[PDB]
Structure formats: structure tokens, C-alpha cells
């Protein structure tokens, strides 16, 4: 019964208008159950090739996601990797994650989604996604999303040179095989490797590792970044998880970039959202979405 093409058409109809799209509950449940199968059939550490486009946090800003595809090209015109945090804070987490899961189902080798720290029941129960599910559908539907999120991949490597994850590095990360050995479904624990990949931050005033101001995980300095790239023969860390004025921001002499794709985040910031294009030779460039004032 699941009509993916129809679902996508309905979701995309609203372009040019914060109007809602009201799918059937059994349609949304279907998106979760089919996408969960695909997530589990693919590696937890994704190995990807350029060219592709990479986006950071969306946080339910559905019309801003549409604007990203409008300028980047709708799938499969371009390959996409998203770095997590699809839900919470914004007004339309449901439309947002539904469109992303529909595209994952339609183009599973051209379209990729990583886990953010908000794709976690203990977080998105509180920061809006649960409230949105309960209001528009019911609790059962929220529990179905949780079951799906628990199977999302955690990291990706593009052409063996760009390591991507939502949060950042971990003092525990010595071998990529460690990520590969993480079994799914899993919740995000309160500490340890998986926690750090979704929660850690770079910090220019830290030498080595430090306690993170969020109260979760760690901060890491520029030389941690350098040693990591050299040890694993990588060129770049690409991550999200922090709002940044221009939508992208370099760290440690461009050995790390932060991407953030929710313009005017929450309405509480004046930030642009950005997307990073990686062309076939790994030349990276940025497109910026900027709310009028």
C-alpha cells in the first residue's frame, strides 16, 4: 500500500507557500519500518564516494529543508549525506523526517542519513518531537520513530579522506573497526564512544580533552584533530551539532568544518544555514541560505 512516489509528491506540494502535510499514520509507520530495514542492511560506518552534498542540523525546519533541495537539486540529481538532528526545536519535525526517510527508501545508495544526538528518545521526548507526534498522531507513532532512529548509521567516510559524524571525536576511538562493531538497534548511552560521536565539540582553548560545558561528553583541541587525521590518513573532519553564524565554520586550520543547516535557528538566532558540496576530486564549496530581515 505504501506509495513512496505519492508520499513524496504530497510532501513536496507545499513548496512556494509553514503549512502542514498530513500523511496517514500507516504511511508514516511504513516509512519507519522500511527505512529501518535499509539502515540495517547497510554498514553502520558508511563508505561513500564523491560527488555528494552534505548538510548539518535541520531540527524540523521543514521549509528550510525544501529550500536546501531547491538549491542543491532534488534527489537523485545529487547524492546527499545528512549529519543528523532532523527533529526537535522546529515546527515541523514530522514532515522533515518523513521526506528524508522517503528519499532514503527511494534512493538507498544515493541518499544517506546519520544519527544525531536528537535522534535519541531521552532527548527528543523533551525537545519537541514527542509533543508533535502526540498532538498530530499518537504515542505509538513516536515509539515507532524511536525504533527506527535506533538503527541509523553513526559515521561516514567519503573517498577515504573525509570522516563525518554528528558531534565529534572520542578519546576512545583508536580504530574504525570500533565503530563497525557497534551493534544495532542501540540507544545512545550516557558516555563512551557512541555518545562522543554524537555529542563532543571542538574547542580552541583546550589542549587534549576537556569536560564539555553541555554536561555530556567532551571537548577536544586542534592537535587531537591533527593526530587523528594523520593516524587514519584522512584529510578532513566534517561534523554538525553547533549553530554557527555563517552556517559553516572551520577549525584547526580547516582540518575540521562544522556545518549547520537550520537558518534562523528556533527563531532565537540570526544564523544562516549552509550546505557543503564535495565534487569528484574532493573540492569542497559552500551554499548559504540567509533569512531576509
Amino acid at each position: 500500500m505504501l506509495n513512496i512516489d505519492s508520499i513524496i509528491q504530497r510532501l513536496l506540494e507545499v513548496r512556494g507557500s509553514g503549512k502542514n502535510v498530513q500523511l496517514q499514520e500507516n504511511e508514516i509507520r511504513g516509512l519507519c519500518l522500511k527505512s529501518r530495514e535499509i539502515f540495517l542492511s547497510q554498514p553502520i560506518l558508511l563508505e561513500l564516494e564523491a560527488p555528494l552534498k552534505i548538510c548539518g542540523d535541520i531540527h524540523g525546519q521543514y521549509y528550510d529543508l525544501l529550500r536546501l533541495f531547491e538549491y542543491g537539486g532534488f534527489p537523485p540529481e545529487s547524492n546527499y549525506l545528512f549529519l543528523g538532528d532532523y527533529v526537535d526545536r522546529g515546527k515541523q519535525s514530522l514532515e522533515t523526517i518523513c521526506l528524508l526517510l522517503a528519499y532514503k527508501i527511494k534512493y538507498p545508495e544515493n541518499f544517506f542519513l546519520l544519527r544525531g544526538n536528537h535522534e535519541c528518545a531521552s532527548i527528543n521526548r523533551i525537545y519537541g518531537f514527542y509533543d508533535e507526534c502526540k498532538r498530530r498522531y499518537n504515542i505509538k507513532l513516536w515509539k515507532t520513530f524511536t525504533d527506527c532512529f535506533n538503527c541509523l548509521p553513526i559515521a561516514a567516510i567519503v573517498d577515504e579522506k573525509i570522516f563525518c559524524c554528528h558531534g565529534g571525536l572520542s578519546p576512545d576511538l583508536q580504530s574504525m573497526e570500533q565503530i563497525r562493531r557497534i551493534m544495532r538497534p542501540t540507544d545512545v548511552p550516557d558516555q563512551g564512544l557512541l555518545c562522543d560521536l554524537l555529542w563532543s565539540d571542538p574547542d580552541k582553548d583546550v589542549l587534549g580533552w576537556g569536560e564539555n560545558d553541555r554536561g555530556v561528553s567532551f571537548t577536544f583541541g586542534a592537535e587531537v584533530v591533527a593526530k587523528f587525521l594523520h593516524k587514519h590518513d584522512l584529510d578532513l573532519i566534517c561534523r554538525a551539532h553547533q549553530v554557527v553564524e555563517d552556517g559553516y565554520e572551520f577549525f584547526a586550520k580547516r582540518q575540521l568544518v562544522t556545518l549547520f543547516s537550520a537558518p534562523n535557528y528556533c527563531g532565537e538566532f540570526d544564523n544562516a544555514g549552509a550546505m557543503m558540496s564535495v565534487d569528484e576530486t574532493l573540492m569542497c564549496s559552500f551554499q548559504i541560505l540567509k533569512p531576509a530581515e
Binding site: 509553514g18 529550500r67 509533543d131 527563531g267 532565537e268 573540492m283 541560505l289 531576509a292
Partner: peptide, 24 residues
């Protein structure tokens, strides 16, 4: 395969007369 960066960045004005906050 070597990561490089383009100097030019492309900007677009988008809707600022829009609701982006949600209840929680």
C-alpha cells in the same frame, strides 16, 4: 584525492517572515 576549498560562497535570501519556533 585531496580535499580543497572554493573561496567564493553562494548566498540566497529566503523567508524571514516565517514561524520557526515549536512548543516544548
Amino acid at each position: 584525492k585531496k580535499v580543497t576549498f572554493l573561496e567564493e560562497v553562494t548566498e540566497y535570501y529566503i523567508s524571514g517572515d516565517e514561524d520557526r519556533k515549536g512548543p516544548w
